[PDB]
């Protein structure tokens, strides 16, 4: 069964992709969805075997790379973290395969799309089940290749080509740092299997831990889209919608978070990497939360809300709170996928429009979509007793519960991020459903009200809801968004919970803050997020549909105009990256090709030699006049020169200088 989880999504993928002509559209969907659903059941069974009974399972098949000290196997370890990661990844992948049956029903390339969907699932599973750093790197690149293919799926569109390059290259920047960190682990410990690294971590040189830790933090930044290496993820919204929900919101964006949690036994022995994790997460929270409020596309708002939640996880990891980081990762994957799939319902309902400025109404047109989108939003803003409430809010008080200046500072930072999460959460639901219709007649024109005379049987298109495959995943994910956090907090948090005693997560006792978080945090700062959430929601809802001119007054101020543009333009990072990094590299290549390789290297090389030596050859040949009297004088002068050189005991250096001089003169014509 444990191997059968690994290979089953791969088997479906090769049938969907390399034999699509045999099974067709329906055969491809039946095989992939079947092969993912069966894998999901085995994952639920695995979560009970490994996690609840605390029986880790080791499996090694054949060696991969064997050189002296490095022995890397095709080997898999199931531990409490492994089965914890597999639950969101397999369930959401099963619900996104099903959702795609309806969503892409009119696309001409269903077989290839479902092959990509199942191949991504297999690479994600490899990434979390591998028992060594390098095999994880295979799934790390595996999900990156699958992400590039799925972002560029509609490959005749130029902008989706640019986005796919951005995701491939930006992640490769983080791959380069992950490779050096693996090189540093190999150099210090002799190989990279997890057990070896984690058994020797307390004893290795503290500077070595920093080098490895910083290296794997930078790789985590790219895959989890933190402020340094974040720009790819918003651009990844160019793929089809079920890709955004599965790959860029719920599972692959969490690989960086998984890397740090799996590395917790090592990075616990480096406060430097923990402190850098702590601030990097906080920056990412406010950075994206600010940007998302000023986005005009619904998928772009949701993408920046993913970036802000992933920052909350990295923030939590910086407080040595990997269990709370894992709890938020699992919980966020459920309700954030719900928002993406609910958004996909809207985009389908209004003929692919994605701009808030053309929504409005739809509240009576998409009641089921509105309900689950509202349910998901309250989970995102950590409304009390929702699923997201149990994870996010604990992260906040844990930041305060670590009574340190950095911990207090991140609390304030992440609180402001929470404020703007509420703001753009209000912005989505209101501009889509609650506001007046800013879109055209076609969206809202119903057959109940008579408008046409002869084109009455058809020609209404009233922006209705989707079919069963479109709506069933919404209902399921809605239920997880309400009860799953409450049902499961005692596992992931507990108070002295021993779910991760296989050492999947290591928390050094000196890094414990949970006691102070439960008892030492004042009640005012515990409920402060809810006071802010329940008020800025009132402030946001009042500013629209009641005021609606004040924000306009702000926009048309030069201060507000500049503020609006700066945040809409994502702190101008894409502008400055393109100007001074991408175009810098292209111009370096232009110089190298033009001034050196097709330039100076040719002239101080073969081409210059050809020019000069042909000239030298022709000038020397000019002396050969065939005048017998001239050759006679030439013999005579040569005779005298030989006599001089030997008679006067001349310095040999003089003779060589004379020869060089003669070539100089024959360089010059006439």
């Amino acid at each position: 069964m444990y191997l059968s989880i690994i290979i089953l999504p791969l088997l479906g993928s090769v049938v969907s992709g390399f034999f699509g002509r045999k099974v067709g559209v329906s055969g491809a969907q039946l095989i992939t969805c079947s092969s993912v659903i069966i894998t999901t059941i085995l994952s639920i069974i695995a979560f009970f075997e490994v996690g609840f009974n605390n029986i880790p399972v080791t499996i090694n098949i054949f060696r991969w790379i064997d050189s002296e000290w490095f022995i890397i196997n095709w080997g898999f370890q199931y531990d409490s973290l492994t089965v914890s990661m597999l639950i969101p990844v397999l369930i959401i992948s099963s619900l996104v395969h099903i959702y795609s049956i309806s969503y892409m029903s009119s696309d001409p390339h269903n077989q290839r799309f479902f092959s990509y969907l199942s191949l991504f699932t297999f690479m994600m599973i490899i990434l979390v089940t591998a028992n060594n750093y390098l095999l994880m790197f295979v799934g790390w690149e595996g999900v990156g290749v699958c992400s590039y293919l799925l972002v560029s799926f509609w490959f005749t569109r130029i902008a989706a080509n640019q986005s796919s390059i951005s995701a491939f290259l930006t992640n490769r920047v983080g791959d380069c740092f992950l490779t050096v960190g693996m090189f540093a682990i190999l150099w210090s410990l002799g190989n990279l299997d997890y057990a070896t690294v984690f058994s020797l971590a307390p004893y290795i040189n503290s500077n070595v831990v920093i080098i490895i830790g910083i290296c794997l933090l930078i790789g985590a930044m790219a895959k989890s889209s933190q402020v340094g290496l974040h720009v790819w993820l918003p651009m990844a919204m160019e793929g089809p919608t079920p890709v955004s929900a599965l790959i860029h919101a719920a599972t692959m964006v969490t690989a960086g978070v998984y890397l740090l949690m799996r590395s917790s036994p090592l990075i616990e022995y480096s406060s430097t990497v923990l402190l850098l994790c702590l601030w990097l997460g906080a920056i990412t929270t406010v950075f994206s939360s600010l940007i998302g409020l000023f986005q005009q596309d619904i998928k772009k708002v949701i993408a920046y809300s993913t970036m802000s939640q992933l920052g909350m996880m990295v923030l939590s990891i910086g407080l040595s709170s990997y269990n709370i980081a894992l709890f938020h990762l699992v919980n966020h994957a459920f309700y954030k996928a719900l928002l993406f799939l609910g958004a996909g319902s809207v985009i389908h309902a209004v003929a692919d429009n994605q701009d808030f400025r053309k929504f409005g109404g739809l509240i009576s047109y998409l009641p089921l979509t509105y309900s689950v989108m509202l349910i998901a939003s309250l989970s995102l803003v950590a409304f009390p007793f929702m699923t997201g409430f149990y994870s996010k809010d604990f992260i906040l008080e844990s930041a305060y519960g670590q009574f340190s200046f950095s911990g207090v500072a991140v609390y304030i930072i992440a609180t402001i991020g929470a404020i703007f999460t509420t703001l753009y959460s209000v912005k989505v639901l209101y501009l889509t459903f609650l506001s007046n219709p800013n879109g055209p007649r076609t969206y809202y024109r119903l057959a109940i009200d008579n408008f046409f005379s002869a084109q009455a049987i058809k020609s209404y298109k009233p922006a209705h809801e989707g079919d069963f495959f479109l709506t069933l995943p919404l209902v399921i994910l809605a239920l997880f968004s309400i009860f799953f956090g409450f049902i499961t907090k005692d596992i992931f948090i507990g108070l002295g919970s021993n779910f991760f005693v296989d050492n999947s997560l290591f928390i050094h006792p000196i890094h414990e803050i949970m006691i102070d978080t439960e008892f030492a945090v004042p009640v005012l700062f515990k409920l402060l997020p809810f006071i802010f959430t329940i008020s800025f929601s009132v402030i946001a809802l009042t500013l629209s549909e009641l005021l609606s001119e004040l924000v306009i007054y702000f926009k048309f101020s030069r201060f507000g105009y500049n503020i609006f543009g700066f945040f809409n333009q994502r702190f101008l990072i894409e502008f400055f990256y393109n100007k001074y990094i991408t175009n810098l590299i292209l111009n370096l290549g232009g110089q190298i090709t033009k001034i050196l390789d097709k330039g100076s290297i040719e002239l101080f090389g073969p081409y210059g030699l050809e020019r000069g030596l042909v000239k030298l050859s022709k000038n020397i040949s000019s002396l050969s006049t065939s005048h017998v009297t001239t050759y006679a004088l030439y013999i005579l002068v040569g005779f005298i020169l030989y006599l001089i050189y030997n008679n006067l005991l001349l310095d040999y250096s003089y003779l060589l200088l004379i020869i060089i001089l003669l070539l100089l003169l024959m360089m010059i014509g006439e």
């Binding site: 054949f62 060696r63 991969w64 790379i65 064997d66 050189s67 002296e68 490095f70 390098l134 790197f137 295979v138 690149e141 595996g142 290749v145 590039y148 560029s152 490959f155 005749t156 130029i158 080509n161 796919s164 390059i165 491939f168 290259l169 490769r172 920047v173 791959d175 380069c176 490779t179 050096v180 090189f183 190999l186 150099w187 590299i585 292209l586 370096l588 290549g589 232009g590 190298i592 090709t593 050196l596 390789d597 290297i601 040719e602 090389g605 073969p606």
Partner: protein, 494 residues
Amino acid sequence: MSLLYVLLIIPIIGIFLISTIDSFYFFNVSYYKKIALITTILNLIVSLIIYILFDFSNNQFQFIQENLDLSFYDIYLGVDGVSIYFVLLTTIIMPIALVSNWNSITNNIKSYLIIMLLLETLLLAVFLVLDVLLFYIFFESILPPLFILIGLFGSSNKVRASFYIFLYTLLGSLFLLLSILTMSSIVGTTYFDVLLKSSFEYTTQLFLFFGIFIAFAVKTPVWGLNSWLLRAHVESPLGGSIVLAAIVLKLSLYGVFRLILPILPQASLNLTYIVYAIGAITVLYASFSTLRTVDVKELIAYSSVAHAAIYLMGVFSNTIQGLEGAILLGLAHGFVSSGLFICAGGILYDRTGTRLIYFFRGLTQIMPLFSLFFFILCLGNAGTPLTLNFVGEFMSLYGTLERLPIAGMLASTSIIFSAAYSIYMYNRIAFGGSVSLYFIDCFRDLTKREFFILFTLVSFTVILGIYPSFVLDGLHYNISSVVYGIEPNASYLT
């Protein structure tokens, strides 16, 4: 008769049959190409037989023949682990290169086949000779056939390309020859089992290193000595390009394991920083210029320069994993560059008659089979895991990092830039819009021939990317013998 002599003899027989069969039957040129292809298959079958019998942990040369008839220049043949895989690469590549030109060679077909068959014998003899001066003789012997191959079958700029590769290689080689002749004078021979026991004094090693290095940097090539490759690898016929990039670039790498590591250990260790600066510069400069190269075959040719920099840095690492990774990368480069040259110089070029990138776009729409293999090959060029290219790049890069960290860190940036030019070139050709509006006719997809040379090459890189033990197991023991150094509590046991 030794099996190693059979390896060198079979292609000469095929040359004889090709040149005489007109007297036993206007013979169709299909018959000629059938003879040459079967000739390469038998040579491959013999190399497979040798490998089945080959022993992975012997420090004696295997399959050697006693001479007992010593002359001034006697060809001694022998094989060990550090040469066995280059012999296999040569005997696998040669049939694929023949099939890749099955239709595109339209005139002078007999001359083309005889040159390729002669190239097979000469390149194999380079890997099998047990004498350092024999190595130079085979290394330089391939130049006149290569000059003729380019000049009889090359594209519009074939004359300038043929001259460049001949004069660059000759010039570098003349400095290697002076280094070899000095060795021959001090030791009395260049036979491996005698010269490897000699201990040259340090200043002699330094001036021996220079002269061997000048030649190997011309042949790697390092950036700045690489315009012959940017000409010859592009102007060459497709079969010439495959042989030139898959096997001929590997000569300088196998040459380092015979001519520098065992006999110049002190000069090699003291000069590694000069080697690493050149290798680091080559990795960045070649990568940036590959990004701006608009000839599709020139872009695949320039990426060979960047990959060869990494195996060159791995070969000077003086670590087991760096040395094994260098051989692994050399082999993986041979399968990947062969496939990318087939994709560009054989599939795009035959269909369009042009090599300019500006005319290609959206080929996936009409050529799905080409785009599938082309993409997998572009992942191999980017060193994606599950290809043998990742295993070689990782091991080479780890050894370079451990030997000299700043050089490895710069060399590691190849993981970013090889992806950049591979993905950029893939996107512009297969993706990047609908089918190019410059195409008047529609294009057919891969023919069965094109499919099965790409599939075979893609098969080798992926199978060895998942189980690289198939090469490493036969590398470990012999490659131990070229490492230089000691551990304090492990050395001088009593």
